[PDB]
Design a binder for this molecule. Structure first.
Ligand SMILES: Nc1ncnc2c1ncn2[C@@H]1O[C@H](COP(=O)(O)OP(=O)(O)O[C@@H]2O[C@H]([C@@H](O)CO)[C@@H](O)[C@H](O)[C@H]2F)[C@@H](O)[C@H]1O
Length: 322
C-alpha cells in the first residue's frame, strides 16, 4: 500500500506526524509513505523506515519570484513528481486551504483529511473525499495518529507514539555521546528567547559538574549570541554550522537538552532525548512537545526575563528523577 502525506510546514508539525507513520507501519506491514514537505525539513521524513519518496516544496522561497524562469521549472518538477504516482490514499495532515489547493487537490487517490469542525481551517474540509472527525482536545501527535488510523482502517494503539527516528542515528552517534548537554537558545521571536544573562548563569552553575555544553546556531546573529554565551567557559562549545541532520546527530548524543520553544526542541523530543523546554509568551499546553522525558518549564508571569538559571537547573535535576 502506498500513501501520500501532505504535511509541509513547521518543523514541529512535521516531526509530530512521525508517530502516525509508526502506527501505520506496525498495523499494515509493507505500507510506504511519500511525503510533501518544505525543503528545509525534507531530511526529517527520510529518517523514518516507512518513508519512501520525499517530495519537497519551497512555497515561501518560490512565492517571492513566483514566475521566474528557474522557479517555474521547480514548480513544474514538483507538480509532476506530486502527480507521478496513484496513491491508495492521500492524507492531508495539514488541514490548511493553501496546502489543500496547492497540493492535496492535485494528487491521485482517495483524499483524507479532517472534517469541517476539526480541520485547522474548516474550508479545507471541502477538498477531501473522506472527512474524519478528530477531536481537538488532544495533542497534535495523537490527532494525526487518529487521522492515520481512521484513514487507513486500523485502530490507534493505546501505547505512546513512537517517532521512530532515533535508530537512524544510533549507528553513528558522536564519540562523546552522553558527555555533553545541548542548549537550544535560538528561536523566531525576542520574547521567546531566554535572556543571554540567564543562559550564562545556568552554564556557570554547571561549571564544576564536569559536563560539557554544545551550542547550535542556524543564522549569523545566532552564532554571535552563541559566542557570547560561550565566552569564559572552557567546557562550552559553539558548534560549526551544520544541517538539520547534523544538528540532529548532535542532539541524539546529548544527555539532556535545555531549550526555548523552537523546532529543534521538537526534534529533541522526537529523538527521545531528555528535554527541558522553557516557555514564556507561548503556551506549552497548546504547542508543547510530545514524548519521553519531555519537561515543561513555564517562566514566571510568562516572562522569560523572570525565569532564573536556578529554576531551570532544578527542573533538570527533577527531570533526571523520572
Ligand atoms: N540546522 C540548524 N542548526 C541550528 N539551528 C537551526 C537549524 N535549522 C533551523 N535552526 C534554528 O531554529 C530556529 C527556528 O525558529 P522557531 O521560530 O523557533 O521555529 P519553529 O517554527 O520551529 O518554532 C515554533 O514556533 C511556533 C510559533 O511560535 C510561531 O512559529 C511555536 O508554537 C512552536 O512550538 C515552535 F516550535 C531558528 O532560530 C533557526 O535559525
Amino acid at each position: 500500500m502506498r500513501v501520500l502525506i501532505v504535511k509541509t510546514s513547521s518543523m514541529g508539525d512535521v516531526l509530530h506526524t512521525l508517530p502516525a507513520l509508526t502506527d501505520a507501519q506496525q498495523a499494515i506491514p509493507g505500507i510506504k509513505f511519500d511525503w510533501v514537505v518544505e525543503e528545509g525539513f525534507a531530511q526529517i521524513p527520510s529518517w523514518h523506515a516507512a518513508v519512501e519518496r520525499v517530495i519537497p516544496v519551497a512555497i515561501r522561497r518560490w512565492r517571492k519570484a513566483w514566475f521566474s524562469a528557474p522557479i517555474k521549472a521547480e514548480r513544474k518538477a514538483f507538480r509532476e513528481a506530486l502527480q507521478a504516482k496513484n496513491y491508495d490514499a492521500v492524507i492531508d495532515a495539514q488541514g490548511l486551504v493553501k496546502s489543500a489547493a496547492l497540493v492535496t487537490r492535485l494528487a491521485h487517490g482517495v483524499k483524507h483529511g479532517m472534517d469541517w469542525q476539526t480541520a485547522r481551517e474548516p474550508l479545507a474540509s471541502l477538498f477531501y473525499n473522506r472527512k474524519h472527525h478528530i477531536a481537538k482536545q488532544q495533542h497534535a501527535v495523537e490527532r494525526t495518529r487518529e487521522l492515520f488510523a481512521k484513514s487507513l482502517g486500523y485502530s490507534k494503539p493505546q501505547t505512546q507514539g513512537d517517532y521512530a527516528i532515533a535508530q537512524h542515528f544510533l549507528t553513528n552517534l558522536p564519540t562523546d555521546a552522553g558527555e555533553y548537554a545541548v542548549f537550544l537558545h535560538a528561536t523566531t521571536r525576542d520574547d521567546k528567547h531566554w535572556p543571554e544573562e540567564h543562559w550564562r548563569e545556568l552554564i556557570g552553575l554547571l561549571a564544576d559538574s564536569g559536563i560539557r555544553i554544545k551550542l547550535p546556531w542556524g543564522a549569523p546573529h545566532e552564532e554571535e549570541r552563541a559566542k557570547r554565551l560561550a565566552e569564559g567557559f572552557a567546557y562550552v562549545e559553539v558548534l560549526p554550522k551544520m544541517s538539520l541532520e547534523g544538528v540532529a546527530r548532535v542532539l541524539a548524543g546529548a544527555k539532556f537538552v535545555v531549550s526555548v520553544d523552537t523546532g529543534l526542541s521538537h526534534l529533541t523530543a522526537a529523538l527521545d532525548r531528555p528535554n527541558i523546554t522553557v516557555y514564556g509568551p507561548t503556551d506549552p499546553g497548546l504547542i508543547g512537545g510530545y514524548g519521553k522525558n519531555q519537561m515543561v518549564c513555564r517562566a514566571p508571569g510568562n516572562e522569560l526575563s523572570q525565569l532564573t538559571a536556578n529554576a531551570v537547573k532544578q527542573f533538570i535535576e527533577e527531570n533526571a528523577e523520572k
